[PDB]
Design a binder for this molecule. Structure first.
Ligand SMILES: CNC1(C(N)=O)CCCC1
Length: 435
């Protein structure tokens, strides 16, 4: 594995021990061989779990998720996928790591795809080694991989709205359920229905994950209602998964707007990871996987792969050379390598609109490539009427930085800025000049 020019896919089944057994063996070998190593965790929760598995090994934790006094002699760095890609885009020197280890390497957020493209390009150049750890590599067609213990797989109609009748099996259960929903708003309605039926419900999504995930350890619960973020190494002491088998697909329409299409079927990889939350205890056979639809390759034409190209076009590799997407995920949506490469000041604007602005990649790119500076928010108000953002069926309004009350009507409409109440609140603060 550890030889220059090798990319290894470590594709042991979910719960096989990639994170807690194999990763420390890899790191000890890497240290013996004096390999400057990076370990990429998908989330702060996984970063903290890795610290427990690696405790006693000299690892530099480049995350506030871990409170450790570093020796300053570590040659192994650990950070999140997003942090790696962020530091590559910033005017900060990222070491040319000899060994690049990506845990939960199926993650399809743009920064994870971009990190795989950068790393796989360095390996192809003959510069580095890489290990991608995941039960479900890109293009897997198996939604039912092996598990530590037998799983009961059942195809069943799964509610996606509040219900009064016809789904007794949902609430008759006396254990712990992880339920994958396609969106925060859909989980909100299911969670309210379960809470009314007397259940204890925890909701997880990207923006809430570190904080809310701790509740799954610190309090008794009957249901976790989660988006797809729990596919990325989230472990639960559960005995059932309920899987809508649905997700939202961001889609760029006519190069000019992003919609959240669907809900529509998950990929096989997503279905396998959702299912893979259970069957993990070799002493507890018969965990249940209830699934409410089929799989499809909904990663084709999905905006994240075009967003990953926007990121990689703006990462220095060598002269004007541009890192390719990792080959198995490289031909999922039309892109021309280099088409999104920005001149120095526009690139800085692009980076800040993502880092400080918290805007989606695609929307950051539209603003930066238009020659708009980071603090110029006039574009948030000068779009067509059909780009009016709505709040409870009325046009959303903010006070501009000038003190003027204006309707929020962005020049470029990206549905992710108002996917839920928290997103809309954040975008209103942005439009107002508050960050
Ligand atoms: C730059 N990548 C390609 C794409 N996704 O359009 C070019 C055709 C093959 C893959």
């Amino acid at each position: 594995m550890l030889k220059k020019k090798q990319l290894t896919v470590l594709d042991l089944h979910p719960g096989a021990g990639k994170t807690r057994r194999v990763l420390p063996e890899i790191v000890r070998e890497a240290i013996k061989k004096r390999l400057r190593t990076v370990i990429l965790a998908p989330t702060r929760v996984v970063a903290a779990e890795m610290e427990e598995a690696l405790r006693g090994l000299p690892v530099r934790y480049m995350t506030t998720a871990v409170n450790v006094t570093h020796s300053g002699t570590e040659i192994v760095d650990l950070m999140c996928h997003a942090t790696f890609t962020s530091r590559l885009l910033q005017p900060i020197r990222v070491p040319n790591y000899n060994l690049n280890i990506m845990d939960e390497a199926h993650f399809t957020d743009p920064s994870s795809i971009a990190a795989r493209g950068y790393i796989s390009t360095r390996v192809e150049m003959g510069e580095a080694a890489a290990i991608f750890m995941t039960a479900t590599p890109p293009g897997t067609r198996d939604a039912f991989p092996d598990s530590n213990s037998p799983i009961m797989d059942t195809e069943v109609e799964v509610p996606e709205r509040a219900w009064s009748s016809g789904f007794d099996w949902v609430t008759d259960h006396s254990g712990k359920t992880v339920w994958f929903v396609p969106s925060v708003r859909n989980g909100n309605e299911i969670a309210a229905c379960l809470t009314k039926a007397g259940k204890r419900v925890i909701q997880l999504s990207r923006k809430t994950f570190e904080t809310e995930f701790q509740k799954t350890k610190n309090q008794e619960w009957d249901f976790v209602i989660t988006t797809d973020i729990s596919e990325m190494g989230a472990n639960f002491k559960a005995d059932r998964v309920i899987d809508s088998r649905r997700c939202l697909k961001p889609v760029i329409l006519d190069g000019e707007r992003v919609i959240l299409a669907g809900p529509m079927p998950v990929t096989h990889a997503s279905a396998a990871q959702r299912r893979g939350r259970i069957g993990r205890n070799p002493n507890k056979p018969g965990d249940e996987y209830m699934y409410g639809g089929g799989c499809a390759e909904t990663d084709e034409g999905h905006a994240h792969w075009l967003e990953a190209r926007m990121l990689l076009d703006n990462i220095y590799l060598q002269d004007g050379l541009i890192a390719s997407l990792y080959r198995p995920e490289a031909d999922k949506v039309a892109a021309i390598e280099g088409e999104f490469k920005l001149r120095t000041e526009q690139r800085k604007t692009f980076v800040e609109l993502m880092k400080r602005g918290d805007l989606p990649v695609w929307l950051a790119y539209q603003v930066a490539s238009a020659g708009i500076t980071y603090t110029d928010r006039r574009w948030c108000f000068d779009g067509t009427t059909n780009n009016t953002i709505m709040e409870d069926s009325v046009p959303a309004e903010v006070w501009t930085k000038y003190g003027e009350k204006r309707v929020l009507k962005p020049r470029w409409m990206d549905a992710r800025v108002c996917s839920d109440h928290a997103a809309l609140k954040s975008f209103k603060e942005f439009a107002a000049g508050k960050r």
